[PDB]
Structure 1
Amino acid sequence: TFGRCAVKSNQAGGGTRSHDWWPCQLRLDVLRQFQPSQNPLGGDFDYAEAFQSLDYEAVKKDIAALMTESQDWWPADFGNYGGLFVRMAWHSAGTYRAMDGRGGGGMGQQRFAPLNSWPDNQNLDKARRLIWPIKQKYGNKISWADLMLLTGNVALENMGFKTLGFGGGRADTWQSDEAVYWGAETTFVPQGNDVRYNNSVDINARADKLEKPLAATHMGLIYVNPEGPNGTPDPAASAKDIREAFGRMGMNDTETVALIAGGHAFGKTHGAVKGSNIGPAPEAADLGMQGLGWHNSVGDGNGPNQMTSGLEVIWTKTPTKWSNGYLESLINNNWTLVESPAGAHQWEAVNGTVDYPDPFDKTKFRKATMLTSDLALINDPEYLKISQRWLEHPEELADAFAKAWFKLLHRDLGPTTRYLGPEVPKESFIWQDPLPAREGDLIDDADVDKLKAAILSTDGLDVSKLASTAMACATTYRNSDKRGGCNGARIALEPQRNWVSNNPTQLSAVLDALKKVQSDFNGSNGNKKVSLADLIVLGGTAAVEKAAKDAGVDIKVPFSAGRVDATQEQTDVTQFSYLEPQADGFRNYGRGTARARTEEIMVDKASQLTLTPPELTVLVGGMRALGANYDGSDVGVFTANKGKLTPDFFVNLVDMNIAWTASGADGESWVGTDRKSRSEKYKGSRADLVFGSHAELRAIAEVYAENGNQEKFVKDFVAAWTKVMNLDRFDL
């Protein structure tokens, strides 16, 4: 009954579906998201252009004014929505996972299922509705994705905390991103974590064993449980969860303390009435709620009766003004465990001063309070040292918070060339994967023609190696956080140059050869200079073009010059470790895990490259035709014409005179036997054979295997190649 509606609809997709009958079969759903035809702004809409015409300062002015314009349907605590807005922006950005680069604020997904209805996002439906009039006013020129974060940034600045600045540039998305692995649990917090801890309830011991790549301790939470691990009010154990979760989001100890102490300078939690008073979350609510949820039946359900987390904590004596009150209270008070009005565990300074203000009554005051997760920061040796230092040196907290808040909001925005607006911070941060300005003057078409000829006749280079190296560099790109790609020539730097998937000894020979081409060009062409990044892409591109010519198809394969070379200083080894592939179908590398098959990993990667199923399919078949495996093997290379861009991979894959059988125990290797001669003809992988198994992929394989479609195959391959090579070209 989990995942099933009590009433079974017979329209609009109702009825038992293919995925119900065969739930283990590979699904191509993730390659069919975010289609231009589905975007109401149109496929031609240029968000960057719209945003650059935006009256940015006027937007900020209107946001600042909104903060203290209380709306009767959701009255502002202390007459100021600032804290709520900061929470909205920190939950939008706060879903990010550094390992797989998914989550974060970059797609504005908080406004769709499932994030719109996660327990941790309770009442952020109200926050989003409060800023809608600003979205309405400025139209297409500011996205929801940008606006949700800009609102939080402006809120901080209008509560006495100057930030480093801000960068716009997040284009809106138009459907729920159902590609994200948030976990496999079938419940939300307070449950929602049996799978991610492999059924362990040992809260200390399990803390650093959180299922990869997850970055939250329960399904439906941003990071950790505010009442402690599994609701156990043990601050020391909470600190271990915090380090794990924030670390999985790419934040270290300093950053983590700065973000929590920074954030909890502002506003308050809400736990005025028990949860039974609260209606369905937005995705479960009736039409009358018009996109809102968690209707509270006590009074008007708002103001003094607000119920969000079930906790009732006010961290500072000035919740609308930046201060050092969080650390001062945390460290100076004696804490006692108490129940909130809703029944949740929190901490109170029961013999402290009664001077914490009430959000709706200026004559009423409270004692100091904290969450278990706040007390964590003084119940761990490293956090305690940081907290103690910043108690005495609040300027060090302020510096660290400004930097960590900027990172939080912009960690998935991608290269600096994507950042829009008049207050982009000038400092270049390591997590931006920075790139230098170009060297010398840009190569032109005459230079490109000369370079192509040289590259295709240089020691150590050939069509196979050139195509393979270019693709290896390209497929580090992932659209979720806009990291990776060919710009920077980061395949030539650590850690990429020593990834097993890049066949390091072969790679070094290829890069030395391209560096020789570079050295010959640079200094002998006046002030014209070519980057290694451009040479890697041009080499692959020239190889594809010649391979097409050899196959009998004369096509101009386009090349877009202008990539720059990153320095190793700009290329953090830990940050780039996250882009290392477990398997890569384009170069027939690697193997699956106990959780994911090789072909699933391929479809996942394709989705991160924004590829459609035909683009995925044509690229695999072409790479095999080119002999572009990572190790130069013949696995999947079903052709007697290696290096010629024919559809032989598909023709031979679907030849019924070949019988395919498993060879390896692990399911990863397959043999193709000529049924007439009884001799082994081919070796294949799961990435190869899926194209002859899955009914939708095989339908595409058939197109390329059909008589008369040899030129179509080349044209489609060249289009897909160009798309993949240029994914990171935000500079253009």
Structure 2
Amino acid sequence: HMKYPVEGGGNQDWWPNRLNLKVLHQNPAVADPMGAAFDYAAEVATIDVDALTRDIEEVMTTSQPWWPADYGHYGPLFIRMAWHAAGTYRIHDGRGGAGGGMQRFAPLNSWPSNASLDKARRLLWPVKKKYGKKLSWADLIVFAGNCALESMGFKTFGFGFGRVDQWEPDEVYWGKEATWLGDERYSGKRDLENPLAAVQMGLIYVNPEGPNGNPDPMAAAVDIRETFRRMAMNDVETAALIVGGHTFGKTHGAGPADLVGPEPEAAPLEQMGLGWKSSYGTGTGKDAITSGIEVVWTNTPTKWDNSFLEILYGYEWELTKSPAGAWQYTAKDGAGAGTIPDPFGGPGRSPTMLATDLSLRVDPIYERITRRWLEHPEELADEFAKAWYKLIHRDMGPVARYLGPLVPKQTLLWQDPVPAVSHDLVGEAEIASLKSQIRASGLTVSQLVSTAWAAASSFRGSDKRGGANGGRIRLQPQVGWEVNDPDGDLRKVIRTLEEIQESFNSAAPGNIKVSFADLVVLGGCAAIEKAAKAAGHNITVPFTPGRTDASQEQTDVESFAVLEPKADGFRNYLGKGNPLPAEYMLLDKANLLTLSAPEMTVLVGGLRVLGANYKRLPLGVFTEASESLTNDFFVNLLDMGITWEPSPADDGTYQGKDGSGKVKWTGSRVDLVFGSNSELRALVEVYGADDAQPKFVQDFVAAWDKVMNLDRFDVR
């Protein structure tokens, strides 16, 4: 049954797997109530942090009747809240994470693992109310967690504000399963489907009752190890994170799970966007039901100390069931009876642990890490500080974006740092001079453009890693990436740009210097200025200097792995192992570059004729002109005098012939989608009209400049 648009119906219902260009217009300006002048960086730098901290530290100790506070302190709940907000991150595509406060929107707000955090978010309204424009929910949600930690005795490594709120949810592939807590994502031995980073649909990392509900610690550890790995956490960081978290607070499963109402997005209006309404007892506090598990890890649930580990090794564990029928461990032979305080004044309870908590003692690598901390709790405190910090800042992008008086100076490898400007910067005259020098270097328009795109286009906008700043194109791994093709030139191109760097720098007027990283981008710009004149157009391509050159030591090769493009329609590259065909991988790539459909479109057309393609293949190259910047791609794409068919050599390519029956052009799926898809073709008709050529060049230059500048938060 097709439905009203206002109820969700549309063209996706008629052609289930059509290309959805709505990924190229998420969070549109028109749905943003702040208006165009709004600059959060400027707002949030007026915020009195101290007052905010204290305003938060009051909300924590001021219980509220509609969700009373465990042990008269919401801190632990907030820590969980923040950990869940940041804990959706995954390294494969850099999406998830706390960076856009997405936990307040669907689907995340209604994930089973985020049960009860609806009420946690609500409790902070009085803080938001007070601070308004100057404080994003995104910053608030994780700052609350960081304040909770400090409040209850744990001194963190620091904090950074900057996270800009958005107004419609970021749409993200979370898995194929159409049922909450479902599993259709493993294959082979236990290989987790790429790009997911959770073991079941609706969870953060793993199942707290062990794999598929099976409470075997040893196995659970394999799931922990691997999911946490896919959120950028190695064994140490992972163990630090779990013990540190579970040093505070408790689970909730005081009665049957079937007396819990529907999730927020499916709840009735009177609940005011809150869900999971419990008819068991008071439904809250004492009778709270969040996970279904009823554990309290430590006997100091609102203080920081070594209790968690002391208790983990200090007892022997056996399987039991919570009052809701979920697995958990409690201590053998009624040991530690009544040593654990009740959240609301009741009598004491026995020690308890999750299945997954036992993983930290049973798994041999984790045993070794946690035993060590059993006797050296200060190594724990330190490791938890670093990993917590990393956790809630992983998607913040370059350091430049980190704001506030709580940001520490120290450089961290995982931030993919770049050096500070150490010299003066090239002015107009030196830029102009350097462009000439590059044009005479003997490097072709194709080489220069390819190399510039290679480096800059490594940026992804999800976690804002990658980009041309750093000059990492010449380091491992970027330099040896198939798509960047070391077997092609590249090394020839690098060498030549290093020679020009040194020459300019040896003869520089006084104290101006230029980085390698700036020259790579500058080369492309020059090359494009050259191809503009070759097409009888005179323009200057804008260029913003400032990039600095990282070194191999300051570049984590392993972490850079996830940015290797396994596909890039802008160079007609298509590797193996992509989850959908080429036209969809093109769009997702455009998404990751923050590009709009117009922008995506101009770049493809421009890039092709400039000779940007992988191995310089002829695919898409609809021009007779050599390294000239024309709209030829478009004009030829709309030539009905040409007839397209799959290549006989059935290889994902197409042959376009004329009246004479001779192949005239070749193209791939990525090329032809622009003339097939009715929305994209519309755009091609703008850029392929007879009056279109100046506009094509202008917009192409603007889009190119946009990609070059993507990671340049240092000047914004």
- Same fold, judged at TM 0.5 (above): yes
What SS does structure 1 have at the residue aligned with 2:391?
helix
2:88 matched to which residue of 1?
95
Q: CA deviation at 1:43?
A: 3.0
1:174 matched to which residue of 2?
167
1:128 matched to which residue of 2?
121
* Residue in structure 2 matching 1:433, options 416, 419, 422: 416
Per-residue CA distance 1:550-587 (angstroms, 9 max, x = gap) = 22322332111111111111111111111000111111
Q: Conserved in 2, the CA contact under 8 Å of 1:98 and 1:578?
A: yes
* Residue in structure 2 matching 1:334, options 291, 296, 316: 316
* Residue in structure 2 matching 1:578, options 562, 585, 589: 562
2:179 matched to which residue of 1?
187
Instruction: Give me the whole-angstrom Cα distance separating, in 2, the residues matched to 1:666 and 1:365.
Output: 72
1:196 matched to which residue of 2?
185
1:141 matched to which residue of 2?
134
Instruction: Give me the whole-angstrom Cα distance separating, in 1, the residues matched to 2:215 and 2:578.
Output: 35
Q: CA deviation at 1:74?
A: 0.9
Structure 2 residue identity aligned to 1:383: Y
* Aligned length in residues: 712
1:152 matched to which residue of 2?
145
Q: Conserved in 2, the CA contact under 8 Å of 1:622 and 1:647?
A: yes
Identity %: 58
Instruction: Give me the whole-angstrom Cα distance separating, in 2, the residues matched to 1:513 and 1:594.
Output: 34
Structure 1 residue identity aligned to 2:309: L
Matched, 1:424 2:407: yes
Structure 2 residue identity aligned to 1:365: G
Structure 2 residue identity aligned to 1:187: T
Q: Which runs of structure 2 are paired with 1:416-565 in the superposition (5 Å)? A: 416-459=399-442, 461-505=443-487, 506-525=489-508, 526-565=510-549
Instruction: Give me the whole-angstrom Cα distance separating, in 2, the residues matched to 1:14 and 1:573.
Output: 44
Structure 2 residue identity aligned to 1:182: W
1:401 matched to which residue of 2?
384
Structure 1 residue identity aligned to 2:22: D
Structure 1: tracts of 5 or more residues without a match: none
Q: CA deviation at 1:300?
A: 2.9
Instruction: Give me the whole-angstrom Cα distance separating, in 2, the residues matched to 1:595 and 1:440.
Output: 46
Per-residue CA distance 1:13-71 (angstroms, 9 max, x = gap) = 554x3111211222111101022222111233111111111111211111112111111
1:52 matched to which residue of 2?
45
Q: Which runs of structure 2 are paired with 1:15-34 in the superposition (5 Å)? A: 15=9, 17-34=10-27
Q: CA deviation at 1:522?
A: 0.7
* Residue in structure 2 matching 1:111, options 77, 86, 104: 104
Instruction: Give me the whole-angstrom Cα distance separating, in 1, the residues matched to 2:288 and 2:7.
Output: 38
- State the TM-score, normalized to the length of structure 1: 0.95
Per-residue CA distance 1:109-165 (angstroms, 9 max, x = gap) = 000000000000000000100111111111111111111011000100111110001
* Residue in structure 1 matching 2:4, options 10, 20, 28: 10
Matched, 1:639 2:623: yes
Instruction: Give me the whole-angstrom Cα distance separating, in 1, the residues matched to 2:414 and 2:570.
Output: 28
Structure 2: tracts of 5 or more residues without a match: none
Q: Conserved in 1, the CA contact under 8 Å of 2:299 and 2:341?
A: no
Q: Conserved in 1, the CA contact under 8 Å of 2:293 and 2:328?
A: yes
Alpha-carbon distance change, 402 to 670 in structure 1, aligned in 2, over 3 angstroms: same
Instruction: Give me the whole-angstrom Cα distance separating, in 2, the residues matched to 1:425 and 1:380.
Output: 35
1:623 matched to which residue of 2?
607
1:313 matched to which residue of 2?
295
What SS does structure 1 have at the residue aligned with 2:222?
helix
Matched, 1:718 2:712: no
Alpha-carbon distance change, 372 to 587 in structure 1, aligned in 2, over 3 angstroms: same
What SS does structure 1 have at the residue aligned with 2:616?
coil
1:600 matched to which residue of 2?
584
Q: Which runs of structure 2 are paired with 1:343-382 in the superposition (5 Å)? A: 343-350=325-332, 351-362=334-345, 364-382=347-365
1:703 matched to which residue of 2?
686
Per-residue CA distance 1:159-180 (angstroms, 9 max, x = gap) = 11100011111111111111x1
Instruction: Give me the whole-angstrom Cα distance separating, in 1, the residues matched to 2:579 and 2:420.
Output: 42
Alpha-carbon distance change, 143 to 594 in structure 1, aligned in 2, over 3 angstroms: closer
Q: Which runs of structure 2 are paired with 1:204-215 in the superposition (5 Å)? A: 205-206=189-190, 209-215=191-197
User: CA RMSD of the aligned region, Å?
Assistant: 1.5
Alpha-carbon distance change, 693 to 126 in structure 1, aligned in 2, over 3 angstroms: same
Q: Conserved in 2, the CA contact under 8 Å of 1:224 and 1:245?
A: yes
Structure 1 residue identity aligned to 2:694: E
Instruction: Give me the whole-angstrom Cα distance separating, in 1, the residues matched to 2:341 and 2:266.
Output: 33
Alpha-carbon distance change, 42 to 255 in structure 1, aligned in 2, over 3 angstroms: same
Q: Conserved in 2, the CA contact under 8 Å of 1:235 and 1:379?
A: yes
What SS does structure 2 have at the residue aligned with 1:448?
helix
1:386 matched to which residue of 2?
369
Alpha-carbon distance change, 13 to 619 in structure 1, aligned in 2, over 3 angstroms: farther
Instruction: Give me the whole-angstrom Cα distance separating, in 2, the residues matched to 1:270 and 1:13.
Output: 35
- State the TM-score, normalized to the length of structure 2: 0.97
1:613 matched to which residue of 2?
597
Q: CA deviation at 1:358?
A: 3.7
Q: Conserved in 2, the CA contact under 8 Å of 1:591 and 1:668?
A: no
Alpha-carbon distance change, 667 to 112 in structure 1, aligned in 2, over 3 angstroms: farther
Q: Conserved in 2, the CA contact under 8 Å of 1:348 and 1:367?
A: yes
